Each structure stands twice: as C-alpha cells, then as structure tokens.
Amino acid sequence: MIIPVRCFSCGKVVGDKWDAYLRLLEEGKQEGDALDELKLKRYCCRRMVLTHVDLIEKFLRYNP
Amino acid sequence: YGVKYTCGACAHNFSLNKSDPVRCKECGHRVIYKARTKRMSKFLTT
Amino acid sequence: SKEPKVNIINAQDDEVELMLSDVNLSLANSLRRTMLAEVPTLAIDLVEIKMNTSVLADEFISHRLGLIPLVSEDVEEMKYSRDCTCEDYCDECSVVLELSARHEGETTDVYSSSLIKVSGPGNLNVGEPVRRDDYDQGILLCKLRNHQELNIRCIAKKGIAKEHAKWSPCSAIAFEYDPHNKLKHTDFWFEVDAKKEWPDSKYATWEEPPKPGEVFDYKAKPNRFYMTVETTGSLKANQVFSRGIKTLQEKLANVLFELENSR
Amino acid sequence: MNAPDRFELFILPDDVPKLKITPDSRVPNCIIIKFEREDHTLANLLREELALYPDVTFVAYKVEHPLFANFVMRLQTEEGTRPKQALERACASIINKLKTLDHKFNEEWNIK
Ligand SMILES: [Zn+2]
Ligand SMILES: [Zn+2]
Ligand SMILES: [Zn+2]
C-alpha cells in the first residue's frame, strides 16, 4: 500500500529510499548493510520499509 | 466534451434517461459509473 | 568562556551533534520539545483535487502530501491566511501548486518533482518542494497503469508540529547526560554485574569513569548535555535551533508584554 | 468526531487572558497564577530558574487536567519582594543566557 512519508515512530523521511532499496537487493544482495548505508540507523525508522508490504502493485494490475 | 456515465469495458461517455434502455454504445455490459464532479473537492490531510 | 557555553560536535547538512554545557537540565528539556513541537514550518493543508483515477482514495493522497517537506527559509515573514485580511487566502498569505499526471504509456510513476509553483512567493526563497535527492526528484508519490489520470492543486500554509505532525522538522532527537551513572538519577537493573551487563554508550567516551575511592558528591547538579538534532531538510539545522530559541523568545516576549498589560 | 480543533491549544478565544493571578489567603505573600494555553515546555522552565534565585521561598506548578493545555503556578517569596520581578529578571536572565548562547553559538559556528 505504498511507502509511508516520514516514519511513524521518529518522523524521519523514508519516501526516497524505496527505489534505492529494491535495487541494492536485486543486484548488490544486501539487507542490513544496504539500510546502514541508506542512513537508516536506529530500528525506529528502520522497521517502516523492511515491514512495508507494497500491495499497490497488485492493485495496479486492476482496470480503473 | 461533457460526460455522464462511462462503461466498465468500452469506456465511452454516455448519457440517458428512462426507457431509453440501460446498456452502452457497444458493450451490452450494463454497468456504468457516475463520473466525477465539476466543482473541485477539498480534502483534509487527516 | 564564562557562564553558559556551547560546544558543537560533528555536524553535517542533515545533522548537528553537539554538547550544551553550563546550563540546567530543565532548560535543555524545555528547548528539546520546542524544536520537536513549536517551530514554524510550512505544509499543505487544503487540497482541491480535480481528477484522480489512482487506486488510492482522495483523502488518502491528501494525507501523503501533507507530510512532504517544503522550503521554509523566509518562513518567518508570512501570516496565516486566517489572519490575513483577505477572504480565505491569497499570494500574500498562501502558496498554490498544481499537479496533473495522466497515464498514457500502457506503469507511469508520479514523483514530487512534477510540482509547479504557480502562486506568488512575495519574492522570497520559500514554499519550494525541498529536494536533496541526487537527481532532483525526492519522494515518489505513486504509480499508475494504462488510461488512469490525476489532476490536483495544492495550497501550502505555515503551522507547527502542535497543529499537526506533518510540520515538525525535527524527527528524532538524541539526549543523554552522565552516561556513567554518577548522579544516581537511576538504579540499573542487573543479574550479577551491572557494568558488564549494561552496554557502554557511545557518549561514555567523552567523560571519565566514576572512580570508587571518591565518596558520593551530592551538591552536584546536572550540567553538560550531549544531544543531536536530526533534520528532514526545509530549514538549516542551525536556524532550526535559532528560530526555536527565538520562537521561545517570542513566547518569552509576550510573556513580558502580556505581563505589562496586567500591570 | 468529539475531539476539539487542534488550534485550540494555543490561540486564546474571544476575551480570555493568558494569565490570571489570584492572591493566597492561606499564608502571607503568596499567589496562584493560572496560565492559559501552555504546558511543561514553558512551565518547568520558569519553576527551575526560580530555585536559582535564593530570594524565592516557594515555586511549584501543576496541570489541572491533561485534556486542556493549561497549568497553575503557585509561588511564594520573602517579605516585601514581588515575585513578578524575580520572574521578569530570571526570564530576562533566560534571554541573556540565550542571547549569550545565540552569540556563543555564532562565533563557535563561524569557525567551520
Ligand atoms: Zn523511525
Ligand atoms: Zn458498453
Ligand atoms: Zn488569506
């Protein structure tokens, strides 16, 4: 259901990190590290993407 | 220009009234949505 | 130098670690929340959606845009449209933006870069979709398929974190003091050894350990505080401290003004 | 649905004062000040800077109820000394402290 602008817990933005992440996966095969480099330190902002379930993808396969 | 209802398949703006049948300008499929408003709608980010 | 003293630590463009010494905790905490909650910012508040074939609903999108960080450099020289003697809003008190996104290429994506700034800036850097992205298009709003359209129109306004979370430029703030529990304002939990079972904090490297032979100093109070002010963009971390000090002052101002009015 | 409008935590409504001061009969030279549209942010700050001024015989505060952003502050000082002044000074002292801070934060800054 798309990524959440700003993390609930602390507030830090997290909109941009999406495409970046899904790439550092496909190729560079990371998790922990990718994130670390994406500047996502403390678990609070962290859990947002790693727990995000992009439903929108299946929805987009729908007509209107 | 101008639109009333559209079709679930042949998305073609229609417009009708009583007894004038309840189908579409092709597709028999008798669905049809009742298209947006002209006066813009204002929402709250809450 | 003398009484209070500042001691900036490693600072960048999106952070400012630093040490505040010779001050009472009370005031640190006070200042703490002021950044977190009472600093003027600028966020969208009214959205006049024109077209939207997205799978997301109107107010679902409305919410999203509310949080997106906008510029706020000369944010201090503007008034709330509600206070502006203009019925509703205007350039002299509001900032309007447009957005149209039609799906033609039978997955089209909608990034925040596609926003124009049709309204009057009153000639001051502000009300701009703060981009720090390398290319120039931070925060991908959403994707759409075949023939899906989407026409918006955003209006931005002042406001603060109190009024709504979608404002505050803080977003997490570190605060610690006396890493080695010497003032004993806490009683550490443990199974056998406190020191070993309790993780040393990275701030523990800037202060000397307790040292046993010394008795408990009692007349000592909480002095020196290690913080860290993260930022989302919009306002330079420094202003995000100054303006705070100032807003607090502005409050402190009326606190002195209102006072007179009661004399 | 039943929650007030957010902007009611700081804007004063039609004829209502920020401050309300009441004299205390319980003991001589004492007052209870009702603060409207405020919280710990500004409260705790005033309370603190009063135990610095060894001329203040008492200084406490409280939040009547959490739903309403307000608070009452009760202060009592020595003989013939008005609290308001000590409040002014220590408040100014804050500004001075902050004036200094600002400055001390600017020179410090410049060296980068
Ligand atoms: Zn977080
Ligand atoms: Zn049809
Ligand atoms: Zn206006």
Coordinates of C-alpha atoms and ligand atoms in Angstrom, one line a residue:
Chain A
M1 CA 0.0 0.0 0.0
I2 CA 2.9 2.3 -1.0
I3 CA 5.6 3.7 1.4
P4 CA 4.8 6.0 4.3
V5 CA 6.1 9.5 4.0
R6 CA 8.1 10.0 7.3
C7 CA 8.4 7.2 9.8
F8 CA 5.6 7.0 12.4
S9 CA 8.0 6.4 15.4
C10 CA 10.6 9.2 14.9
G11 CA 9.5 11.2 11.9
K12 CA 12.4 10.8 9.6
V13 CA 11.6 10.9 5.8
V14 CA 11.6 7.5 4.0
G15 CA 9.9 8.2 0.7
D16 CA 13.0 8.3 -1.5
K17 CA 14.7 5.2 0.0
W18 CA 12.3 2.9 -1.8
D19 CA 13.7 2.5 -5.4
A20 CA 17.2 2.6 -3.8
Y21 CA 16.4 -0.3 -1.6
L22 CA 14.7 -2.6 -4.1
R23 CA 17.9 -2.2 -6.2
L24 CA 20.5 -2.8 -3.5
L25 CA 18.6 -6.1 -3.2
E26 CA 18.3 -7.3 -6.8
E27 CA 21.9 -6.7 -7.5
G28 CA 24.2 -5.9 -4.5
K29 CA 22.3 -8.6 -2.5
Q30 CA 22.2 -6.8 0.9
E31 CA 19.8 -6.1 3.7
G32 CA 21.4 -4.9 7.0
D33 CA 24.2 -3.2 5.2
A34 CA 22.1 -1.5 2.4
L35 CA 20.0 0.1 5.1
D36 CA 23.0 1.1 7.2
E37 CA 24.3 2.8 4.1
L38 CA 20.9 4.3 3.2
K39 CA 21.5 6.1 6.6
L40 CA 18.8 4.1 8.4
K41 CA 20.4 3.7 11.9
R42 CA 18.0 3.1 14.8
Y43 CA 15.2 0.4 14.4
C44 CA 12.5 3.0 14.8
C45 CA 12.7 4.5 11.2
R46 CA 14.1 1.2 10.1
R47 CA 11.1 -1.1 10.5
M48 CA 9.0 1.1 8.2
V49 CA 10.4 -0.1 4.8
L50 CA 11.5 -3.6 5.9
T51 CA 7.9 -4.1 7.1
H52 CA 6.2 -2.4 4.2
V53 CA 4.0 -4.6 2.0
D54 CA 3.7 -3.0 -1.4
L55 CA 0.1 -4.0 -2.2
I56 CA -0.3 -1.2 -4.8
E57 CA 1.5 -3.5 -7.3
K58 CA -1.4 -6.0 -7.5
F59 CA -3.9 -3.1 -7.4
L60 CA -2.3 -1.5 -10.4
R61 CA -3.0 -4.7 -12.4
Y62 CA -6.6 -3.7 -12.0
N63 CA -8.5 -1.8 -14.7
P64 CA -9.9 1.5 -13.4
Chain B
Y1 CA -16.8 17.5 -24.2
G2 CA -19.3 16.7 -21.4
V3 CA -19.9 13.3 -19.8
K4 CA -22.5 11.5 -17.6
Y5 CA -21.7 7.8 -17.3
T6 CA -18.9 5.7 -18.7
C7 CA -18.8 1.9 -19.4
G8 CA -17.0 -0.8 -17.5
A9 CA -15.5 -2.0 -20.8
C10 CA -16.0 0.3 -23.7
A11 CA -15.2 3.3 -21.5
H12 CA -17.5 5.6 -23.6
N13 CA -19.2 8.6 -22.0
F14 CA -22.9 8.0 -22.4
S15 CA -26.0 10.0 -21.1
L16 CA -29.6 8.7 -21.0
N17 CA -32.9 8.8 -19.2
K18 CA -36.0 6.5 -18.6
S19 CA -37.0 3.8 -21.1
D20 CA -34.0 4.7 -23.3
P21 CA -32.5 1.2 -22.4
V22 CA -29.8 0.5 -19.8
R23 CA -26.9 -0.6 -22.0
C24 CA -23.9 1.1 -23.7
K25 CA -22.8 2.4 -27.1
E26 CA -21.5 -1.1 -27.9
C27 CA -20.8 -3.4 -25.0
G28 CA -24.1 -4.9 -23.7
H29 CA -22.5 -5.0 -20.3
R30 CA -25.0 -2.9 -18.3
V31 CA -22.6 -1.5 -15.6
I32 CA -21.7 2.3 -15.9
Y33 CA -20.1 4.6 -13.2
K34 CA -21.4 8.1 -12.5
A35 CA -18.4 10.3 -13.4
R36 CA -16.7 12.9 -11.1
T37 CA -18.0 16.4 -10.2
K38 CA -17.0 19.7 -11.8
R39 CA -16.7 21.7 -8.6
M40 CA -13.4 20.7 -7.2
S41 CA -13.4 18.8 -3.9
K42 CA -11.3 19.9 -1.0
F43 CA -9.9 17.3 1.4
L44 CA -8.1 17.3 4.8
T45 CA -4.8 15.5 5.4
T46 CA -6.3 13.9 8.5
Chain C
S1 CA 34.2 31.5 28.0
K2 CA 32.0 32.3 31.1
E3 CA 28.6 31.2 32.2
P4 CA 26.7 29.1 29.6
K5 CA 28.9 27.6 26.9
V6 CA 28.3 25.9 23.6
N7 CA 30.4 23.0 22.2
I8 CA 29.3 21.9 18.7
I9 CA 30.2 18.3 17.8
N10 CA 30.4 16.6 14.4
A11 CA 27.8 18.5 12.2
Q12 CA 26.7 17.9 8.6
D13 CA 23.8 19.0 6.4
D14 CA 21.3 16.6 7.8
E15 CA 22.5 16.5 11.5
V16 CA 24.3 18.6 14.2
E17 CA 25.6 16.5 17.1
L18 CA 26.8 18.9 19.9
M19 CA 27.4 19.5 23.6
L20 CA 25.5 22.1 25.6
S21 CA 27.3 22.9 28.8
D22 CA 26.9 25.1 31.9
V23 CA 23.0 25.0 31.8
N24 CA 20.2 23.5 33.9
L25 CA 18.6 20.3 32.6
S26 CA 15.2 21.9 33.0
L27 CA 16.1 24.3 30.2
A28 CA 17.7 21.7 27.9
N29 CA 14.4 19.6 28.0
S30 CA 12.4 22.8 27.6
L31 CA 14.4 23.6 24.4
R32 CA 14.2 19.9 23.4
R33 CA 10.4 19.9 22.9
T34 CA 10.4 23.4 21.4
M35 CA 12.2 22.1 18.3
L36 CA 10.1 18.9 18.3
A37 CA 6.8 20.8 18.6
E38 CA 6.8 24.6 18.3
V39 CA 8.9 25.6 15.4
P40 CA 7.1 27.3 12.4
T41 CA 7.3 25.1 9.3
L42 CA 5.2 25.0 6.1
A43 CA 2.9 22.2 4.9
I44 CA 0.0 21.6 2.6
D45 CA -3.4 22.0 4.5
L46 CA -6.0 22.4 1.8
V47 CA -6.2 20.2 -1.3
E48 CA -8.5 20.9 -4.3
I49 CA -8.4 17.6 -6.1
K50 CA -9.6 18.0 -9.7
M51 CA -9.0 14.5 -11.2
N52 CA -7.8 11.2 -9.6
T53 CA -8.0 7.8 -11.2
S54 CA -5.4 6.4 -8.8
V55 CA -6.3 3.3 -6.8
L56 CA -5.7 5.4 -3.7
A57 CA -8.6 7.5 -2.4
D58 CA -8.8 11.3 -2.3
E59 CA -8.1 11.9 1.4
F60 CA -5.6 9.0 1.3
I61 CA -3.5 11.1 -1.1
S62 CA -4.3 14.4 0.7
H63 CA -2.6 12.9 3.8
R64 CA 0.5 11.9 2.0
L65 CA 1.3 15.4 0.6
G66 CA 0.7 16.9 4.0
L67 CA 3.9 15.4 5.4
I68 CA 6.2 16.2 2.4
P69 CA 8.8 18.7 3.4
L70 CA 8.7 22.1 1.7
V71 CA 11.1 25.0 1.8
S72 CA 10.9 27.3 4.9
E73 CA 13.8 29.8 4.6
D74 CA 11.9 33.1 4.8
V75 CA 9.0 31.3 6.5
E76 CA 9.1 33.8 9.4
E77 CA 7.9 36.7 7.3
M78 CA 4.4 35.3 6.4
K79 CA 1.0 35.4 8.1
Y80 CA -1.8 32.8 8.4
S81 CA -4.4 33.3 5.7
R82 CA -6.9 33.3 8.6
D83 CA -5.2 36.4 10.0
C84 CA -4.7 37.9 6.5
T85 CA -7.4 40.4 5.9
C86 CA -8.1 38.6 2.6
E87 CA -11.3 36.4 2.4
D88 CA -9.9 32.8 2.6
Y89 CA -6.4 33.0 1.2
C90 CA -4.0 34.6 -1.4
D91 CA -0.4 35.0 -2.6
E92 CA 0.3 37.4 0.2
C93 CA -0.7 34.6 2.6
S94 CA -0.8 31.2 0.8
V95 CA 1.2 29.2 -1.8
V96 CA -0.6 27.3 -4.5
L97 CA 0.8 24.4 -6.6
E98 CA -0.6 22.3 -9.5
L99 CA -0.2 18.7 -10.5
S100 CA -1.6 16.8 -13.4
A101 CA -0.5 13.2 -14.2
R102 CA -2.0 11.2 -17.0
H103 CA -1.3 7.5 -17.6
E104 CA -0.6 7.0 -21.2
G105 CA 2.3 4.6 -21.6
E106 CA 0.3 1.4 -21.2
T107 CA 3.2 1.7 -15.1
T108 CA 3.8 5.5 -15.1
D109 CA 5.2 6.9 -11.8
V110 CA 4.4 10.2 -10.1
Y111 CA 7.4 11.8 -8.3
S112 CA 7.2 15.1 -6.3
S113 CA 9.4 16.8 -8.9
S114 CA 6.4 17.4 -11.2
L115 CA 5.1 20.2 -9.0
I116 CA 5.0 23.8 -10.2
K117 CA 4.7 26.9 -8.0
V118 CA 2.0 29.0 -9.8
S119 CA 1.4 31.4 -6.9
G120 CA 3.2 34.5 -5.6
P121 CA 6.3 33.9 -3.4
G122 CA 6.3 37.5 -2.3
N123 CA 9.9 37.3 -3.6
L124 CA 11.5 35.1 -1.0
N125 CA 13.1 31.6 -1.2
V126 CA 10.3 29.5 0.4
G127 CA 7.4 27.2 -0.4
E128 CA 9.6 25.0 -2.6
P129 CA 9.5 21.2 -2.7
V130 CA 12.8 20.7 -0.8
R131 CA 14.9 18.3 -3.0
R132 CA 18.2 16.9 -1.7
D133 CA 17.9 13.9 -4.0
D134 CA 20.9 13.5 -6.2
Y135 CA 19.0 13.6 -9.5
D136 CA 16.3 16.2 -8.4
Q137 CA 13.0 14.4 -7.5
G138 CA 12.7 13.2 -3.9
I139 CA 9.7 11.1 -2.7
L140 CA 8.0 9.0 -5.4
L141 CA 4.2 9.7 -4.7
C142 CA 2.7 6.8 -6.8
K143 CA 2.4 4.7 -9.9
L144 CA -0.5 4.2 -12.4
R145 CA -1.3 1.8 -15.3
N146 CA -3.0 2.3 -18.7
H147 CA -5.5 5.2 -19.0
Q148 CA -5.6 6.5 -15.4
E149 CA -5.5 10.2 -15.0
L150 CA -4.8 12.5 -12.0
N151 CA -5.2 16.3 -11.6
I152 CA -4.5 18.0 -8.3
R153 CA -3.9 21.6 -6.9
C154 CA -2.1 22.0 -3.6
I155 CA -2.2 25.0 -1.2
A156 CA 0.5 25.3 1.5
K157 CA 0.4 27.2 4.8
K158 CA 2.5 27.9 7.9
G159 CA 1.6 25.9 11.0
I160 CA 3.6 24.0 13.6
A161 CA 4.1 20.5 15.0
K162 CA 1.4 21.1 17.6
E163 CA -1.2 21.8 15.0
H164 CA -0.1 18.6 13.2
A165 CA 2.9 16.2 13.0
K166 CA 3.1 16.9 9.3
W167 CA 5.1 20.0 10.3
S168 CA 7.9 19.4 12.8
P169 CA 11.4 19.4 11.1
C170 CA 12.9 17.5 14.0
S171 CA 12.2 13.8 13.5
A172 CA 14.1 12.1 16.4
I173 CA 16.5 13.8 18.8
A174 CA 19.2 12.3 20.9
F175 CA 19.6 13.3 24.6
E176 CA 21.7 11.8 27.3
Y177 CA 23.7 13.0 30.3
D178 CA 26.1 11.5 32.8
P179 CA 26.5 8.1 30.9
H180 CA 28.3 6.7 33.9
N181 CA 25.6 6.9 36.5
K182 CA 27.3 9.2 39.0
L183 CA 24.4 11.4 40.0
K184 CA 22.5 8.2 40.5
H185 CA 19.3 9.5 39.0
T186 CA 18.7 5.9 38.0
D187 CA 19.0 2.4 39.6
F188 CA 20.4 0.0 37.0
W189 CA 18.8 -3.5 36.7
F190 CA 21.1 -6.5 36.6
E191 CA 21.6 -10.2 37.3
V192 CA 25.2 -10.2 38.5
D193 CA 27.4 -7.3 37.2
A194 CA 25.8 -4.0 36.2
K195 CA 28.9 -2.6 34.3
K196 CA 29.3 -5.7 32.1
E197 CA 25.6 -6.4 31.5
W198 CA 24.8 -2.7 30.7
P199 CA 26.1 -1.5 27.3
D200 CA 28.5 1.4 27.4
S201 CA 27.0 4.3 25.4
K202 CA 29.0 5.9 22.7
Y203 CA 28.8 9.1 24.8
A204 CA 30.7 7.4 27.5
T205 CA 33.9 8.2 25.6
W206 CA 33.7 11.9 26.4
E207 CA 33.8 11.6 30.2
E208 CA 35.9 10.0 32.9
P209 CA 34.7 6.9 34.8
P210 CA 33.4 7.2 38.5
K211 CA 36.5 6.1 40.5
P212 CA 35.5 4.3 43.8
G213 CA 37.8 5.9 46.4
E214 CA 35.9 9.1 45.9
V215 CA 32.7 9.5 48.1
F216 CA 29.4 10.4 46.6
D217 CA 29.4 14.1 45.6
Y218 CA 25.9 15.3 46.5
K219 CA 25.7 19.1 45.9
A220 CA 26.3 18.4 42.2
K221 CA 23.6 19.1 39.7
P222 CA 23.0 18.0 36.0
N223 CA 25.5 20.0 33.9
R224 CA 26.5 19.4 30.3
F225 CA 24.2 17.6 27.9
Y226 CA 25.0 15.6 24.8
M227 CA 22.4 15.9 22.0
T228 CA 21.9 15.5 18.3
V229 CA 19.4 17.4 16.1
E230 CA 18.4 15.4 13.0
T231 CA 16.7 17.4 10.2
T232 CA 14.5 16.5 7.2
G233 CA 15.6 19.4 5.1
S234 CA 13.4 22.5 4.9
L235 CA 15.4 24.6 7.4
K236 CA 19.1 24.6 8.0
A237 CA 19.7 22.7 11.3
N238 CA 21.2 26.0 12.7
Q239 CA 18.0 28.0 12.1
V240 CA 16.1 25.0 13.4
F241 CA 17.8 25.9 16.7
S242 CA 17.9 29.7 16.4
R243 CA 14.2 30.1 15.4
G244 CA 13.5 27.8 18.3
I245 CA 15.5 30.0 20.7
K246 CA 13.6 32.8 19.0
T247 CA 10.1 31.4 19.0
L248 CA 10.7 30.6 22.7
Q249 CA 11.8 34.2 22.9
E250 CA 8.7 35.4 21.0
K251 CA 6.8 33.5 23.6
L252 CA 9.0 34.9 26.3
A253 CA 8.3 38.2 24.6
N254 CA 4.6 38.1 25.0
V255 CA 5.2 36.7 28.5
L256 CA 6.8 40.1 29.2
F257 CA 4.3 42.0 27.1
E258 CA 1.1 40.3 28.5
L259 CA 2.8 41.0 31.8
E260 CA 2.7 44.7 31.3
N261 CA -0.9 44.5 30.2
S262 CA -1.6 43.1 33.6
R263 CA 0.1 45.9 35.5
Chain D
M1 CA -15.8 13.4 16.0
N2 CA -15.7 14.7 19.6
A3 CA -12.2 16.0 19.7
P4 CA -11.7 19.8 19.7
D5 CA -10.0 21.6 16.8
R6 CA -6.2 21.2 17.3
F7 CA -5.6 25.0 17.1
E8 CA -7.3 25.4 20.5
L9 CA -4.2 24.6 22.4
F10 CA -2.5 28.0 21.8
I11 CA -4.9 30.5 20.3
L12 CA -6.9 32.4 23.0
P13 CA -10.6 32.7 22.4
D14 CA -12.8 35.8 22.5
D15 CA -11.8 37.8 25.6
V16 CA -9.7 35.4 27.8
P17 CA -6.5 36.2 29.4
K18 CA -3.3 34.2 29.1
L19 CA -2.5 35.0 32.7
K20 CA -4.8 35.0 35.7
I21 CA -3.3 35.9 39.1
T22 CA -5.0 35.2 42.4
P23 CA -3.8 36.1 46.0
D24 CA -3.4 33.4 48.6
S25 CA -5.1 33.8 52.0
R26 CA -3.6 30.5 53.4
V27 CA -0.3 32.3 54.0
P28 CA 1.1 35.8 53.7
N29 CA 2.7 37.0 50.4
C30 CA 1.7 34.1 48.1
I31 CA -0.1 33.8 44.7
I32 CA -1.6 31.2 42.4
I33 CA -1.2 32.0 38.7
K34 CA -3.4 30.3 36.2
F35 CA -1.6 30.0 32.8
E36 CA -3.8 29.6 29.7
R37 CA -2.6 27.8 26.5
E38 CA 0.7 26.4 27.8
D39 CA 2.5 23.3 29.1
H40 CA 5.6 21.9 30.6
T41 CA 7.7 23.5 27.8
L42 CA 7.3 26.9 29.4
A43 CA 6.2 25.9 32.8
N44 CA 9.1 23.7 34.2
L45 CA 11.4 26.4 32.7
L46 CA 10.1 29.1 35.0
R47 CA 9.9 26.8 38.0
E48 CA 13.6 25.9 37.6
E49 CA 15.1 29.4 37.2
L50 CA 13.3 30.3 40.5
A51 CA 15.2 27.9 42.7
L52 CA 18.3 29.7 41.4
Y53 CA 17.2 33.0 42.8
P54 CA 17.7 32.3 46.5
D55 CA 15.1 35.0 47.2
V56 CA 12.2 32.7 46.3
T57 CA 10.7 30.9 49.3
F58 CA 8.4 28.6 47.1
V59 CA 7.7 27.7 43.5
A60 CA 5.6 24.8 42.2
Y61 CA 3.3 24.2 39.3
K62 CA 0.7 21.7 38.1
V63 CA -1.5 20.7 35.2
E64 CA -5.2 20.8 36.3
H65 CA -6.1 18.2 33.7
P66 CA -4.2 16.8 30.6
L67 CA -7.0 17.4 28.1
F68 CA -6.6 21.1 28.5
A69 CA -3.2 22.6 27.8
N70 CA -3.1 25.0 30.7
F71 CA -1.4 25.0 34.2
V72 CA -1.4 26.7 37.6
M73 CA 1.8 28.0 39.2
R74 CA 1.9 28.8 42.9
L75 CA 4.8 31.0 44.1
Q76 CA 5.7 32.5 47.5
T77 CA 8.7 34.7 48.2
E78 CA 10.3 36.5 51.2
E79 CA 8.9 39.7 52.7
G80 CA 8.2 42.8 50.6
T81 CA 9.6 41.3 47.4
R82 CA 7.2 40.9 44.4
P83 CA 7.6 37.6 42.5
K84 CA 6.8 39.1 39.2
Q85 CA 10.1 40.9 39.2
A86 CA 12.1 37.8 40.0
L87 CA 10.1 36.2 37.2
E88 CA 11.0 39.1 34.9
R89 CA 14.7 39.0 35.7
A90 CA 15.1 35.2 35.7
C91 CA 13.1 35.4 32.4
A92 CA 15.4 38.1 31.1
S93 CA 18.3 36.1 32.5
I94 CA 17.0 33.3 30.2
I95 CA 17.1 35.7 27.3
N96 CA 20.5 36.9 28.4
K97 CA 21.6 33.3 28.7
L98 CA 20.0 32.7 25.3
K99 CA 21.4 36.0 24.0
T100 CA 24.8 34.8 25.1
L101 CA 24.0 31.3 23.8
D102 CA 23.0 32.6 20.4
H103 CA 26.2 34.7 20.2
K104 CA 28.3 31.9 21.6
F105 CA 26.7 29.7 19.0
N106 CA 27.5 32.1 16.2
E107 CA 31.2 32.6 16.9
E108 CA 31.6 28.8 17.6
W109 CA 29.8 28.2 14.3
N110 CA 31.8 30.6 12.2
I111 CA 35.0 28.6 12.8
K112 CA 33.8 25.9 10.4
Ligands
ZN1 ZN 12.0 5.8 12.8
ZN2 ZN -20.7 -0.8 -23.2
ZN3 ZN -5.7 34.6 3.5

